[PDB]
Amino acid sequence: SMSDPVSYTRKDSIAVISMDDGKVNALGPAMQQALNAAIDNADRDDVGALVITGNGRVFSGGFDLKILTSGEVQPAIDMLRGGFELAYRLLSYPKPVVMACTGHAIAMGAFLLSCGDHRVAAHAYNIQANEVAIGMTIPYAALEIMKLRLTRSAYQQATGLAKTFFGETALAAGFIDEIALPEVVVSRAEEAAREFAGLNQHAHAATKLRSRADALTAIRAGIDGIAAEFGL
Amino acid sequence: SMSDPVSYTRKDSIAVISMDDGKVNALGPAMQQALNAAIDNADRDDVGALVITGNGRVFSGGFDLKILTSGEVQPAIDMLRGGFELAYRLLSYPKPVVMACTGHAIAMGAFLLSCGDHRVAAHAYNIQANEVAIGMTIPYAALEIMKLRLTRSAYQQATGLAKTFFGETALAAGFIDEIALPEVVVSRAEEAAREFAGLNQHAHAATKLRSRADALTAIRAGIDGIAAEFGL
Amino acid sequence: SMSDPVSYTRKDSIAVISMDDGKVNALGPAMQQALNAAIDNADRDDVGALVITGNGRVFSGGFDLKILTSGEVQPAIDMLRGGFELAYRLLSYPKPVVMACTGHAIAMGAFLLSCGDHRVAAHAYNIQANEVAIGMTIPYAALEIMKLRLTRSAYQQATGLAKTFFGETALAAGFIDEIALPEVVVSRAEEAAREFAGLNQHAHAATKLRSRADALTAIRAGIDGIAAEFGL
Ligand SMILES: CCC[C@H](O)CC(=O)SCCNC(=O)CCNC(=O)[C@H](O)C(C)(C)COP(=O)([O-])OP(=O)([O-])OC[C@H]1O[C@@H](n2cnc3c(N)ncnc32)[C@H](O)[C@@H]1OP(=O)([O-])[O-]
Ligand SMILES: CCC[C@H](O)CC(=O)SCCNC(=O)CCNC(=O)[C@H](O)C(C)(C)COP(=O)([O-])OP(=O)([O-])OC[C@H]1O[C@@H](n2cnc3c(N)ncnc32)[C@H](O)[C@@H]1OP(=O)([O-])[O-]
Ligand SMILES: CCC[C@H](O)CC(=O)SCCNC(=O)CCNC(=O)[C@H](O)C(C)(C)COP(=O)([O-])OP(=O)([O-])OC[C@H]1O[C@@H](n2cnc3c(N)ncnc32)[C@H](O)[C@@H]1OP(=O)([O-])[O-]
């Protein structure tokens, strides 16, 4: 539901966090708060791993366009900061995080997707930073998230050319780690999550931070520089 | 012709710049001036995108070997600086740049190729930094251009081992973005160019600079350090 | 033999260095000294290229676990420093280095493997940094070695998730450069070595250092920071 856009379900060693706002899982304030609250729940349950899913229509269509373009600056800035804060939180999360990309992932939807330790999508799901196509420059925080995962040549095209990836081209590019049929995307993500929960948690938490140190520092800077993007 | 080695042709939303010196499109002073002048023309026409092609024999065989090895130092330095200046100009160009790799691309030919936003080649076209094979160390400016596009492992082999890439291995390595049959390489490049011209120009110009900032800074330094390569 | 775990054989333009301790080629002090001594021999013979092989069972199972977990700190530190010193030496070696991955390569075995200019393995050979699986954080020196070769997304999974790679997935990830049938892994490595020996040696030595400068600096730092890993 739009009022209640996130569900949380503990399954033995994992927690499944599912976005469904009835529409395209826009990452506005309500959605961000719902996600953060679900993660707090996973912290409380001390689960072995997280799965985050979209709905049957998309993973996420990104930030809420209504807020972004209402003509009020501070709320748009605040929505942007919160989205990238959440990305930071997922990239630094001390448990394995698996993304079940259950539909298209556009812009912030794709940036959020790129925060998972393991990412599962179906062959025909579009993954795209479409900013340049719609006349926006890609924020530094988003650039750093993408640069952490996309091959050097895919990064060039994904950014400057707003290239759309899917299936095998998304896998080769580093926009996803696993392809599965639509009807088993979630099951495959849960399966992967259960396996990762068997890894040593301390070693995983510590190693992932080392493998992402420079990106996380650059993302923190990008979050604090969001206002400057606007020139504000 | 060798005297007139570059043609410029505006086609609606794109400009097609074609190298043909009657030979292997050596990137000597005349060729560099011809290319720069054609780009100035594209600036004047305010086109949506550029396509740059080679001839039916090669994309380019790289710098003019006659000048490089004549035994006169300053002209060789000046040719090298101009080639990498042109590369800098293409990597920072505010319109999408599509390379039609119409034949082999060796050394500076491959470095020039790697300056396109989108690069199209045929299956059997060799793309290779052959410096190490012929007893030269790869200039820092060239290393940075390659590092911007080649995967980490392909970069290692392309440089130290002068590895030759083509077709699928060039695509996987990040030496090209698209493979096409020889007879449609140019058509595919033009088609891609027309599509990219539909992107928001300001957003594209700004985003590509962000996606290349560190490389461009390192390339500027490499251009100013060309003389030092010789130990001069 | 365990007492005599390394053989050295000059073949025309190449030297073949073969690990076989009768077991899993554990990289303890004896093995490290044997390897260094074999390399000194290659220096003396001034060969064109090196091939390093494992045995019929593995490339290497990594550091000696007996020493690592005996409960004596300084010998474990010293073994670790020596392994990464040897890696530094191979990455900076002035002749082409080809690894014949003749069996599985785990942890330091995989890090050692990643020091070759060209790496050949068979389809079913597991290559894995398994540290996180067994509750250890990956040392910075090892992280830098891996980051030099693994694609951005493969690096994430190889480290934080202790992902196992093999065959095509290892090739795509950048854990190897060539796949061959088990019975010709060594022959293919020797063949590649002979070809690389035909490259200009000075240009190769100089170019590989440039292509690895930042990694080598970070690896030197990681070697000098091994004691700190323990918190010692
Ligand atoms: C400045 C830096 C910021 C950062 O970089 C990102 C920016 O946001 S730039 C990136 C900017 N993002 C984009 O330019 C495009 C993002 N969206 C899309 O690409 C497609 O809509 C999507 C593939 C998600 C769904 O395709 P589909 O399945 O064919 O469905 P559909 O297309 O017919 O739309 C369905 C309904 O949902 C609505 N709606 C859609 N998106 C949003 C949104 N972000 N928010 C709110 N609503 C959104 C839409 O209005 C419609 O509502 P209604 O009243 O019921 O008709
Ligand atoms: C120091 C840092 C600098 C930077 O890093 C790069 C350096 O330059 S290092 C890289 C150095 N580059 C190389 O080591 C090799 C570059 N060239 C090649 O790899 C091949 O020639 C190529 C594939 C291009 C064409 O193959 P193909 O189709 O079989 O044709 P072909 O092979 O039979 O030669 C055709 C004709 O063109 C001539 N010619 C060729 N290249 C050049 C040149 N760069 N210039 C002038 N001329 C050149 C050749 O002399 C011949 O002339 P002629 O009097 O009519 O006989
Ligand atoms: C802190 C930072 C350090 C750095 O990051 C790396 C660390 O070391 S973390 C990484 C830590 N490494 C690991 O967690 C695992 C590494 N080893 C393996 O993954 C597998 O053993 C391997 C695939 C190599 C062989 O499989 P297989 O063919 O089925 O054979 P097998 O499995 O049945 O064992 C055969 C025999 O060799 C023995 N032995 C094995 N490894 C070692 C060793 N490293 N040393 C000494 N011995 C070793 C084993 O005890 C056995 O002896 P025995 O008395 O005759 O029974």
Side-chain angles (χ1 to χ4, degrees), chain A residues 2 4-22 24-65 67-231, chain B residues 2 4-22 24-65 67-231, chain C residues 2 4-22 24-65 67-231:
Chain A
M2 177 68 69
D4 181 28
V6 172
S7 71
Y8 173 98
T9 307
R10 190 181 195 177
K11 300 183 171 193
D12 48 277
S13 62
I14 73 168
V16 180
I17 293 173
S18 298
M19 294 179 289
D20 182 14
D21 66 351
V24 297
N25 292 333
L27 296 166
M31 178 69 86
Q32 301 180 15
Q33 189 284 339
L35 288 173
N36 280 298
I39 299 170
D40 291 348
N41 206 340
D43 291 345
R44 292 190 300 268
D45 295 342
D46 189 26
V47 301
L50 301 187
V51 176
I52 298 169
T53 85
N55 60 26
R57 193 164 308 169
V58 296
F59 181 64
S60 175
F63 287 121
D64 188 349
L65 286 175
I67 289 169
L68 189 65
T69 63
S70 78
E72 289 187 273
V73 169
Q74 188 63 225
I77 285 167
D78 281 335
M79 176 182 63
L80 262 42
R81 181 185 307 104
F84 290 115
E85 215 94 85
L86 175 61
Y88 184 99
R89 180 179 195 184
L90 295 165
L91 283 167
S92 62
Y93 200 67
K95 313 304 176 58
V97 177
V98 183
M99 298 296 179
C101 191
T102 52
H104 310 302
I106 307 296
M108 188 65 218
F111 310 148
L112 177 56
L113 178 65
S114 308
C115 294
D117 294 294
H118 186 71
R119 309 155 290 174
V120 187
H123 70 286
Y125 297 170
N126 293 327
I127 307 167
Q128 183 200 19
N130 70 327
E131 282 78 357
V132 166
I134 61 170
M136 288 189 263
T137 301
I138 300 185
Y140 284 115
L143 286 178
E144 296 286 339
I145 291 164
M146 280 190 292
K147 201 183 87 177
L148 185 61
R149 305 308 276 279
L150 296 188
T151 69
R152 288 152 169 184
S153 278
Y155 178 72
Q156 289 302 314
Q157 300 211 317
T159 56
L161 302 175
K163 180 178 180 174
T164 294
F165 301 80
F166 46 80
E168 297 290 341
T169 75
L171 181 58
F175 246 143
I176 57 183
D177 311 288
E178 175 175 0
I179 309 173
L181 289 182
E183 61 268 23
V184 297
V185 166
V186 175
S187 172
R188 293 294 186 269
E190 289 168 341
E191 172 181 293
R194 291 192 315 266
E195 174 179 3
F196 299 148
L199 292 176
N200 182 274
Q201 184 275 323
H202 180 92
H204 167 74
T207 302
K208 74 198 295 184
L209 292 177
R210 294 186 169 190
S211 75
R212 294 165 193 183
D214 285 354
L216 289 168
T217 295
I219 291 169
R220 171 60 57 201
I223 288 173
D224 297 331
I226 281 288
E229 306 259 356
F230 291 78
Chain B
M2 177 68 69
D4 181 28
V6 172
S7 71
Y8 173 98
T9 307
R10 190 181 195 177
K11 300 183 171 193
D12 48 277
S13 62
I14 73 168
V16 180
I17 293 173
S18 298
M19 294 179 289
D20 182 14
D21 66 351
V24 297
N25 292 333
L27 296 166
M31 178 69 86
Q32 301 180 15
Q33 189 284 339
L35 288 173
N36 280 298
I39 299 170
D40 291 348
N41 206 340
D43 291 345
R44 292 190 300 268
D45 295 342
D46 189 26
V47 301
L50 301 187
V51 176
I52 298 169
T53 85
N55 60 26
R57 193 164 308 169
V58 296
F59 181 64
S60 175
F63 287 121
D64 188 349
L65 286 175
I67 289 169
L68 189 65
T69 63
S70 78
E72 289 187 273
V73 169
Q74 188 63 225
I77 285 167
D78 281 335
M79 176 182 63
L80 262 42
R81 181 185 307 104
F84 290 115
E85 215 94 85
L86 175 61
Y88 184 99
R89 180 179 195 184
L90 295 165
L91 283 167
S92 62
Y93 200 67
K95 313 304 176 58
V97 177
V98 183
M99 298 296 179
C101 191
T102 52
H104 310 302
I106 307 296
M108 188 65 218
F111 310 148
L112 177 56
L113 178 65
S114 308
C115 294
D117 294 294
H118 186 71
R119 309 155 290 174
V120 187
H123 70 286
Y125 297 170
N126 293 327
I127 307 167
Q128 183 200 19
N130 70 327
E131 282 78 357
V132 166
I134 61 170
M136 288 189 263
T137 301
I138 300 185
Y140 284 115
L143 286 178
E144 296 286 339
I145 291 164
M146 280 190 292
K147 201 183 87 177
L148 185 61
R149 305 308 276 279
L150 296 188
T151 69
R152 288 152 169 184
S153 278
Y155 178 72
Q156 289 302 314
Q157 300 211 317
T159 56
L161 302 175
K163 180 178 180 174
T164 294
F165 301 80
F166 46 80
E168 297 290 341
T169 75
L171 181 58
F175 246 143
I176 57 183
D177 311 288
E178 175 175 0
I179 309 173
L181 289 182
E183 61 268 23
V184 297
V185 166
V186 175
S187 172
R188 293 294 186 269
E190 289 168 341
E191 172 181 293
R194 291 192 315 266
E195 174 179 3
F196 299 148
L199 292 176
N200 182 274
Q201 184 275 323
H202 180 92
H204 167 74
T207 302
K208 74 198 295 184
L209 292 177
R210 294 186 169 190
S211 75
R212 294 165 193 183
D214 285 354
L216 289 168
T217 295
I219 291 169
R220 171 60 57 201
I223 288 173
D224 297 331
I226 281 288
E229 306 259 356
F230 291 78
Chain C
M2 177 68 69
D4 181 28
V6 172
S7 71
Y8 173 98
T9 307
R10 190 181 195 177
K11 300 183 171 193
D12 48 277
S13 62
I14 73 168
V16 180
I17 293 173
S18 298
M19 294 179 289
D20 182 14
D21 66 351
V24 297
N25 292 333
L27 296 166
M31 178 69 86
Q32 301 180 15
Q33 189 284 339
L35 288 173
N36 280 298
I39 299 170
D40 291 348
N41 206 340
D43 291 345
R44 292 190 300 268
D45 295 342
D46 189 26
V47 301
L50 301 187
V51 176
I52 298 169
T53 85
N55 60 26
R57 193 164 308 169
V58 296
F59 181 64
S60 175
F63 287 121
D64 188 349
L65 286 175
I67 289 169
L68 189 65
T69 63
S70 78
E72 289 187 273
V73 169
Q74 188 63 225
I77 285 167
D78 281 335
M79 176 182 63
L80 262 42
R81 181 185 307 104
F84 290 115
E85 215 94 85
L86 175 61
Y88 184 99
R89 180 179 195 184
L90 295 165
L91 283 167
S92 62
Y93 200 67
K95 313 304 176 58
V97 177
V98 183
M99 298 296 179
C101 191
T102 52
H104 310 302
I106 307 296
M108 188 65 218
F111 310 148
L112 177 56
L113 178 65
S114 308
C115 294
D117 294 294
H118 186 71
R119 309 155 290 174
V120 187
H123 70 286
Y125 297 170
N126 293 327
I127 307 167
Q128 183 200 19
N130 70 327
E131 282 78 357
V132 166
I134 61 170
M136 288 189 263
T137 301
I138 300 185
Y140 284 115
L143 286 178
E144 296 286 339
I145 291 164
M146 280 190 292
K147 201 183 87 177
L148 185 61
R149 305 308 276 279
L150 296 188
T151 69
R152 288 152 169 184
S153 278
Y155 178 72
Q156 289 302 314
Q157 300 211 317
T159 56
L161 302 175
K163 180 178 180 174
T164 294
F165 301 80
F166 46 80
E168 297 290 341
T169 75
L171 181 58
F175 246 143
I176 57 183
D177 311 288
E178 175 175 0
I179 309 173
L181 289 182
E183 61 268 23
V184 296
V185 166
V186 175
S187 172
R188 293 294 186 269
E190 289 168 341
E191 172 181 293
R194 291 192 315 266
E195 174 179 3
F196 299 148
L199 292 176
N200 182 274
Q201 184 275 323
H202 180 92
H204 167 74
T207 302
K208 74 199 295 184
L209 292 177
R210 294 186 169 190
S211 75
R212 294 165 193 183
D214 285 354
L216 289 168
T217 295
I219 291 169
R220 171 60 57 201
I223 288 173
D224 297 331
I226 281 288
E229 306 259 356
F230 291 78

